[PDB]
Design a protein around this ligand. Structure first.
Ligand SMILES: [Ca+2]
Ligand SMILES: [Ca+2]
Ligand SMILES: [Ca+2]
Ligand SMILES: [Ca+2]
Ligand SMILES: [Ca+2]
Ligand SMILES: [Ca+2]
Ligand SMILES: [Ca+2]
Ligand SMILES: [Cu+2]
Ligand SMILES: [Cu+2]
Ligand SMILES: [Cu+2]
Ligand SMILES: [Cu+2]
Lengths: 213, 213
């Protein structure tokens, strides 16, 4: 059986609407006047109205720019029915997949994270864990893949490189010895999350580490 | 059977190329890797290469801007063959119709027409017939429908309106009496053929009428 191929539609389309995606046809046009229709989430089910089909021509229509972050793929079904009201074709699967654009910056779950670590802890230890999320595609592209780093550390005593972060998980570790509560009680780190695995747009949040002698 | 609908492609399309018209798919993709091809005048037959198809994806491609005046309609067939070398679908007819643009001016059969009429002829008689052709569509549009007229007459003696031309057939007639061989031997008319039934682009040729005793 010949089947309609899935339809790839890049999100945030600028062209005019409605947009013609594809066109259905039943070879039983020769014998009788045929009428086309579509059903499924996106047509007659919520979100209703996004996809429609011209009853007599069979043109699949898109009325709104799509947002991949909202719905990545729609699973609709096209129908063909003679004047009799009875279907003359088995429903056809119309898969409409939305391609991703990097239109979302990373966002930290919280503006500020609080953690704590002890005095004589050996380098390579865990302190706390911060997390940021990017709603873009993180499977086929890097538009959604988040990378972690540290922008600055205050104060810069005894050293400027007192902590570190795993680029993928975002858990902060003690990199250098010399932690002392009597000297410095709190460490204000400004952590950074950037998409494109470090090559794209960036956002920042605060991570407070109190020391425990 | 769900079949691919005809494909309308306006002639003289700008880029980019190749252009994706439609895409084929056999649901036997589920079982085996399928390979696609197309045959017929326009693909493998003259004019060869105009339409081709990506073997693994099944994208129908157009490689050159089309000219309707050359070929109005292509009748191709798409094939699906499994990796094993066996056809998995009955060939499907991919009909590609080219819609017309008004890109052809009328052309007179001759750069100059020679005709003759007698001196004492009564108004309303026929003299000669000029003809121009438009290679554009004259059935669905008026891009090819030609209308005739007279731009000038030299000399303009005894009168400026000595002749006339039927707007449809293009046969020149004497509208006014007063033809004299002793006074004026030749009449250099510059006749005009314009498409759009008189409202479009125009071209002109000359029609020389010698008068006879
Ligand atoms: Ca989006
Ligand atoms: Ca996106
Ligand atoms: Ca992103
Ligand atoms: Ca042409
Ligand atoms: Ca034309
Ligand atoms: Ca024309
Ligand atoms: Ca005489
Ligand atoms: Cu609309
Ligand atoms: Cu700064
Ligand atoms: Cu090409
Ligand atoms: Cu002139």
């Amino acid at each position: 059986e010949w089947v309609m191929p899935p339809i790839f539609v890049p999100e945030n389309g600028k062209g005019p609407f409605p947009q013609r995606l594809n066109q259905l046809k039943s070879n039983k046009d020769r014998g009788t006047k045929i009428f086309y229709s579509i059903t499924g989430p996106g047509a007659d089910s919520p979100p209703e109205g996004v996809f429609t089909i011209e009853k007599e021509s069979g043109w699949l229509l898109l009325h709104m720019p799509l947002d991949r972050e909202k719905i990545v793929k729609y699973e609709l079904y096209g129908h063909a029915v003679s004047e009799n009201g009875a279907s003359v074709e088995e429903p056809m699967n119309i898969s409409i997949i939305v391609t991703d654009q990097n239109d979302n910056k990373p966002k930290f779950t919280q503006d500020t994270f609080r953690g704590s670590v002890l005095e004589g802890v050996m380098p390579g230890t865990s302190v706390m864990q911060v997390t940021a999320t990017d709603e873009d595609d993180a499977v086929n592209t890097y538009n959604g893949v988040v990378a972690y780093s540290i922008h600055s550390q205050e104060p810069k005593e005894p050293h400027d490189l007192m902590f570190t972060i795993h680029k993928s998980t975002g858990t902060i570790s003690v990199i250098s010895s010399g932690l002392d509560r009597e000297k410095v009680p709190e460490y204000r780190l400004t952590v950074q999350a950037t998409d494109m695995d470090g090559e794209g747009s960036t956002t920042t949040a605060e991570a407070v580490v109190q020391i425990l002698d």
